[PDB]
Design a protein around this nucleic acid. Structure first.
Ligand SMILES: [Mg+2]
Ligand SMILES: [Mg+2]
Ligand SMILES: [Mg+2]
Ligand SMILES: [Mg+2]
Ligand SMILES: [Mg+2]
Ligand SMILES: [Mg+2]
Ligand SMILES: [Mg+2]
Ligand SMILES: [Mg+2]
Ligand SMILES: [Mg+2]
Ligand SMILES: [Mg+2]
Ligand SMILES: [Mg+2]
Ligand SMILES: [Mg+2]
Ligand SMILES: [Mg+2]
Ligand SMILES: [Mg+2]
Ligand SMILES: [Mg+2]
Ligand SMILES: [Mg+2]
Ligand SMILES: [Mg+2]
Ligand SMILES: [Mg+2]
Ligand SMILES: [Mg+2]
Ligand SMILES: [Mg+2]
Ligand SMILES: [Mg+2]
Ligand SMILES: [Mg+2]
Ligand SMILES: [Mg+2]
Ligand SMILES: [Mg+2]
Ligand SMILES: [Mg+2]
Ligand SMILES: [Mg+2]
Ligand SMILES: [Mg+2]
Ligand SMILES: [Mg+2]
Ligand SMILES: [Mg+2]
Ligand SMILES: [Mg+2]
Ligand SMILES: [Mg+2]
Ligand SMILES: [Mg+2]
Ligand SMILES: [Mg+2]
Ligand SMILES: [Mg+2]
Ligand SMILES: [Mg+2]
Ligand SMILES: [Mg+2]
Ligand SMILES: [Mg+2]
Ligand SMILES: [Mg+2]
Ligand SMILES: [Mg+2]
Ligand SMILES: [Mg+2]
Ligand SMILES: [Mg+2]
Ligand SMILES: [Mg+2]
Ligand SMILES: [Mg+2]
Ligand SMILES: [Mg+2]
Ligand SMILES: [Mg+2]
Ligand SMILES: [Mg+2]
Ligand SMILES: [Mg+2]
Ligand SMILES: [Mg+2]
Ligand SMILES: [Mg+2]
Ligand SMILES: [Mg+2]
Ligand SMILES: [Mg+2]
Lengths: 143, 111, 101, 117, 49
RNA sequence: CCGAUAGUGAACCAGUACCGUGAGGGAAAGGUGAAAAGCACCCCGGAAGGGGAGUGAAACAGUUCCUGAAACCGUGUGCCUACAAGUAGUUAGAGCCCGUUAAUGGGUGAUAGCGUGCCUUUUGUAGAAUGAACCGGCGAGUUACGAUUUGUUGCAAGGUUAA
RNA sequence: UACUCGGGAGUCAGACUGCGAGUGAUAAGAUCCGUAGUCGAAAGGGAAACAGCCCAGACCACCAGUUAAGGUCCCCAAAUA
RNA sequence: GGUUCGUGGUAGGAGAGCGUUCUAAGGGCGGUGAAGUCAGACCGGAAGGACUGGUGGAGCGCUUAGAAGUGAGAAUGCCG
């Protein structure tokens, strides 16, 4: 019958810049994932993309409660025998904050082709300077 | 009126060995297709050459078309009646052998 | 303007001159049907019923009494030798909306 | 008398083969795999004819929640207020209003806010 | 009786039951015999007493 | 009673061909057309085979020759497809292409949710337990004479004949 | 509903879970009994996936509503109560 | 025609039907095209039944009964 289904390009997609100073990693990532998915619009159609673009600055000051800065480990395997490698969360925050935020957010997106398209809409910077001033992004405040 | 054709029914060559040469002269001018068939070293080339020249001849005689403005409109190979033979293997058993035939069709039309 | 009427155990949004398909109603082709259960009238002014907007009705005209396309309901259980086949064809009533009150 | 089996088997198998038009590979050509494909498709249709209603209700709920969070209200609070105010509009119509009659949706949300307090 | 309207007495004739013709009739695979005994075999069974 | 996998093993040069030292075992194989009127003549080719012409109601009836299904092999094209993890479908669905036994129509489908074939045998099988390469034909509770019980019909303290 | 008379059967490899016992080592997805449930012959929702555990019994259609176990930050519907 | 209670299901019991070949009677169609075959978006609660168009080139349905060599996806099934 009669239920509204959106079409590609029919919904405006905006740009946001989010300051990540002091916020917890997961509590920031949940909000950002909801923004990327497009769940904050009454036009939300599950099978297409209606979400927004997100820029995250000051990723080097993201928060980690407890002893997570030393006791949380990130693992990789190269698919070669005995080729497992580890890395602690504080080390990545010091050295590659962008990749820490990207892993955290990527774990919270759907695991299909649409999720892989949504991941490409996230730009993470360790400093306070971004190169997307041409898109005229707005400021988004959490919660 | 505008197309002529000729077929070669139940030629002894197998279809898979003639299709590989037919796939070369499709949609080409006859003057070039004859040279294509003349300089390719396969066993199916003389048969297809004879079929193509027959089609050109009966285009020129039956329908009075211009030779220099002809192209190979379509060419295909169909299966024919196969002959069943045998080959004596070791320890007293025989194995099947298929002596396959084919039908070759080419159609020439002006362009 | 438009209204939200309730008919057939479910609710429908109707505008004037629209064509709608509903559950089978008692009526003949060309008759006049009125809906006395209106939940919401909108368009340049909004009045909400609790649960119904009293005094408001929608008038419609019967266009067709028929049955939908055929379905085939089929069930089976593997390894238990159980199958069951059945065809279905749901009857409907087609209406055209005349006026909203 | 003898009853040889002609004309009856082919007619019955061709219907099943025709029912499997559009299936990959030999599932639309051979009777034995086409039969299994058709049976499985009927079973899947029977199950999804039930799952469709749940799927659409979930979509409507998500859409209403998104539209009502812009009025500083949850879906939970809005639904409670609507029940408490006496309004009996289902999620389908509310989602429609949220999409393309947002003013009327805001009116209903205001009434729900009145009911809560 | 016109020989084209012969209607025999009602209830005097019934339809013979044919076993082993598909699972829709309830007498399909095993044909009313159960599973794998002496009584499921052709000509199988015990004496009268 | 059968109608060319049927009916004799054999509808046709069948106890033949073929197999075995031997006794012996033992097939496959029907149909042009009403009438050969069975394609004079021209063209390509060594020929086969074709394209015209002609005969014929029909040659897409041209010597496995009435009909000519499926597996299988090809040619042309409308929609989709080279960042994707897939019992191959089903439900939601844009875009593009069409136009029917005319009706809330047809084809293909980017993307999203759900989803471990059929049979047999088992307490329990998606099962790393069994069977099947695919398509077609053939292939399994019957008959005679007795026993018992239910239904129907005729007559009824009687009913009924067998050779 | 129960009982009597008559026609027709199939079944006599059971499984796990809670409780009461034996054998075992107060081991076993062990074995053998008593009692109740579920599977067998039962789909649907929850335990990630999962015959036997918890909720609950599919006549068919619906783009309707209220609830059960279990849940409401994101994957994933619903409290960043 | 109504009220109430029901309608998961293996082995298995009971009931009602579809379709195939042949026979009997009535009544039909077919060289202005039969059976078969191919394609469709039609009809019935199921097994199933029509209609239209191509190919085919001489036989075939319908109604009421009766009789069975009576319906195949599997047997390391037989033949092609
Ligand atoms: Mg099972
Ligand atoms: Mg006969
Ligand atoms: Mg058969
Ligand atoms: Mg497809
Ligand atoms: Mg629901
Ligand atoms: Mg019966
Ligand atoms: Mg049964
Ligand atoms: Mg079976
Ligand atoms: Mg058995
Ligand atoms: Mg046993
Ligand atoms: Mg037994
Ligand atoms: Mg025996
Ligand atoms: Mg024959
Ligand atoms: Mg014979
Ligand atoms: Mg000899
Ligand atoms: Mg003759
Ligand atoms: Mg010649
Ligand atoms: Mg023909
Ligand atoms: Mg004839
Ligand atoms: Mg064919
Ligand atoms: Mg990638
Ligand atoms: Mg791509
Ligand atoms: Mg379509
Ligand atoms: Mg069992
Ligand atoms: Mg076992
Ligand atoms: Mg395997
Ligand atoms: Mg075995
Ligand atoms: Mg095998
Ligand atoms: Mg017996
Ligand atoms: Mg009597
Ligand atoms: Mg009894
Ligand atoms: Mg005993
Ligand atoms: Mg025992
Ligand atoms: Mg026991
Ligand atoms: Mg104990
Ligand atoms: Mg134990
Ligand atoms: Mg045990
Ligand atoms: Mg039970
Ligand atoms: Mg269950
Ligand atoms: Mg379940
Ligand atoms: Mg677990
Ligand atoms: Mg599940
Ligand atoms: Mg029930
Ligand atoms: Mg509720
Ligand atoms: Mg039942
Ligand atoms: Mg019975
Ligand atoms: Mg006949
Ligand atoms: Mg015809
Ligand atoms: Mg038979
Ligand atoms: Mg077979
Ligand atoms: Mg074979």
């Amino acid at each position: 019958r009669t239920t509204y289904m959106a079409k590609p390009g029919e919904v405006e997609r905006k740009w946001y810049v989010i300051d990540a100073t002091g916020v917890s990693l997961g509590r920031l990532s949940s909000e950002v994932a909801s923004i990327l998915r497009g769940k904050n619009k009454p036009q939300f159609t599950p099978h297409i993309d209606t979400g927004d673009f997100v820029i995250i600055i000051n990723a080097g000051k993201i928060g980690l409660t407890g002893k997570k800065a030393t006791d949380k480990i990130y693992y990789r395997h190269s698919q070669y025998p005995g080729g497992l490698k580890s890395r602690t969360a504080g080390e990545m925050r010091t050295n590659n904050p962008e990749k820490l935020l990207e892993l955290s957010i990527k774990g919270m997106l759907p695991k299909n082709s649409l999720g892989r398209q949504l991941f490409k809409k996230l730009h993470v910077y360790g400093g306070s300077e971004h190169e997307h001033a041409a898109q005229k992004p707005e400021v988004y405040e959490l919660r | 009126v505008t197309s002529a054709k000729a077929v070669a029914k139940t030629v002894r060559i197998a279809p898979r060995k003639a299709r590989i040469v037919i796939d070369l002269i499709r949609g080409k001018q006859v003057g070039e297709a004859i040279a294509i068939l003349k300089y390719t070293p396969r066993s199916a080339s003389p048969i297809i050459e004879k079929v193509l020249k027959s089609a050109i001849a009966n285009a020129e005689h039956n329908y009075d078309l211009d030779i220099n403005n002809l192209v190979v409109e379509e060419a295909f190979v169909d299966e024919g009646p196969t002959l069943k033979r045998f080959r004596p293997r070791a320890q007293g058993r025989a194995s099947a052998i298929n002596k396959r035939t084919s039908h070759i069709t080419v159609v020439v039309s002006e362009v | 303007m438009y209204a939200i009427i309730e008919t057939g155990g479910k609710q429908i949004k109707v505008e004037a001159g629209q064509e709608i398909y509903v559950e089978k109603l008692a009526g003949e082709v060309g008759d006049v049907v009125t809906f006395d259960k209106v939940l919401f009238v909108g368009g340049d002014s909004a009045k909400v019923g609790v649960p119904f907007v009293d005094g408001a009705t929608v008038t419609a005209k019967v266009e067709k009494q028929g049955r939908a396309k055929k379905l085939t309901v089929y069930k089976y259980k593997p390894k238990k030798n159980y199958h069951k086949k059945q065809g279905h064809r749901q009857p409907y009533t087609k209406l055209t909306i005349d006026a909203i009150n | 008398p003898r009853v040889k089996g002609g004309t009856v088997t082919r007619k019955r198998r061709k219907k099943i083969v025709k029912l499997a038009k559009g299936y990959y590979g030999s599932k639309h050509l051979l009777f034995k795999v086409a039969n299994q494909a058709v049976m499985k498709s009927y079973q899947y249709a029977y199950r999804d004819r039930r799952q469709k209603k749940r799927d659409f209700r979930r979509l409507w709920i998500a859409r209403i929640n998104a539209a009502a969070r812009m009025q500083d209200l949850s879906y939970s609070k809005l639904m409670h207020g609507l029940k408490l105010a006496g309004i009996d509009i289902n999620r389908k119509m509310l989602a429609d209003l949220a999409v393309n009659d947002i003013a009327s949706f805001n009116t209903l949300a205001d009434s729900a806010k009145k009911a809560l307090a | 009786m016109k020989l084209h309207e012969l209607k025999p007495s009602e209830g005097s004739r019934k339809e013979r039951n044919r076993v082993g013709r598909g699972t829709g009739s309830g007498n399909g695979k095993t044909s009313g015999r159960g599973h794998k005994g002496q009584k499921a075999r052709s000509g199988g069974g015990v004496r009268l007493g």
